[PDB]
Amino acid sequence: EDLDTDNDNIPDSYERNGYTIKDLIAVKWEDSFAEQGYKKYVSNYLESNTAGDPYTDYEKASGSFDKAIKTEARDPLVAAYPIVGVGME
Amino acid sequence: EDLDTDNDNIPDSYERNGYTIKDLIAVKWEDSFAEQGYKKYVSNYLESNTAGDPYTDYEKASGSFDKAIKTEARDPLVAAYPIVGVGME
Ligand SMILES: [Ca+2]
Ligand SMILES: [Ca+2]
Ligand SMILES: [Ca+2]
Ligand SMILES: [Ca+2]
Numbered sequence: 267e268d269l270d271t272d273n274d275n276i277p278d279s280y281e282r283n284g285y286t287i288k289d290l291i292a293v294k295w296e297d298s299f300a301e302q303g304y305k306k307y308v309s310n311y312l313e314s315n316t317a318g319d320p321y322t323d324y325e326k327a328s329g330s331f332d333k334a335i336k337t338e339a340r341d342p343l344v345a346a347y348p349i350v351g352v353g354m355e
Numbered sequence: 356e357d358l359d360t361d362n363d364n365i366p367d368s369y370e371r372n373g374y375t376i377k378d379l380i381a382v383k384w385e386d387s388f389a390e391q392g393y394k395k396y397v398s399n400y401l402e403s404n405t406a407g408d409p410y411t412d413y414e415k416a417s418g419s420f421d422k423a424i425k426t427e428a429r430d431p432l433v434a435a436y437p438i439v440g441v442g443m444e
Contacts, residue, residue: 271379312379318422 272314275324281309287328309342317345361403364413370398376417398431406434 276292284295309323310316323342339346358367365381373384398412399405412431428435
């Protein structure tokens with residue numbers, strides 16, 4: 267309902283069932299939201315960083331991190347992580 | 356009961372007899388919990404770090420540390436301790 271355990275801005279049941287971010291707040295997910303371009307997010311309600319990256323579930327879902335991070339890292343289940351490598355010429 | 360001497364988050368009489376961590380809260384151990392995959396933990400109620408590693412009994416038991424640590428270092432009786440060596444080729 268409104269209980270928060272991992273102490274982010276997303277309640278327990280919202281993460282357990284499904285939520286989306288609009289106007290910088292978390293709301294329950296409804297299937298009619300998809301055709302507006304919204305996305306369905308599920309996270310871990312006992313952890314503040316589900317993926318393990320420095321950014322928390324709220325920051326990732328609401329896109330409050332560095333704006334250069336790819337949009338496919340916004341869902342909490344995908345980690346924001348670089349794969350930098352070196353090649354010789 | 357509810358006394359806490361070493362000032363971790365685990366009560367005095369729980370560490371003496373046995374406890375398990377669920378929902379980030381220490382509870383008494385019942386033998387019916389074993390088939391669910393839970394484990395029985397016993398610690399030292401006069402020390403905040405039974406093994407001597409940097410992580411306390413509560414952090415070790417609840418798995419609230421670096422997620423790269425092996426799961427066999429979660430009971431508060433096995434030290435989280437690396438063994439690093441060098442070999443020449
Ligand atoms: Ca939460
Ligand atoms: Ca979470
Ligand atoms: Ca204690
Ligand atoms: Ca202790």
